[PDB]
């Protein structure tokens, strides 16, 4: 299974942190099974429906 | 004290903490599932049973 390199999870500025404009605890809820996030939504299949 | 909004969010705040530590992280998790006993326990074996019946009746 995929993992993430600490070099730029961890850091002063957690660079992926700052690409996927989150933060860092926001960061190891998910990359540490504590919390989920959503990958994708429908937008059509719910403005229709 | 246990009633009327005090200990019930209060349970939800508490158990809904970071848990730095991997290990109390599992051991919060563990702490989910009640335990069983025996009726419960033959009760499922019996599922099983029923269950790879059936995946053998599809095979």
């Not at chain 1, 850091?11 to 989920?36: T, W």
């Not at chain 2, 909004?5 to 989910?32: F, N, P």
Request: aromatic content about 8%; glycine content about 4%.
């Amino acid at each position: 299974a995929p993992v993430t390199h600490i070099w730029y999870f961890k850091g002063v500025p957690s660079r992926l942190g700052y690409l996927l404009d989150l933060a860092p605890k926001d960061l190891e809820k998910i990359i540490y099974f504590a919390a989920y996030v959503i990958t994708s939504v429908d937008e059509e299949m719910r403005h229709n429906e | 004290e246990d009633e009327s909004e005090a200990l019930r969010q209060a349970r939800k705040d508490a158990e809904l903490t970071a848990s730095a530590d991997s290990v109390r992280a599992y051991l919060k998790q563990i702490g989910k599932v009640a335990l069983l006993n025996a009726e419960e326990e033959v009760e499922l074996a019996k599922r099983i049973e029923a269950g790879l019946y059936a995946t053998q009746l599809m095979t």
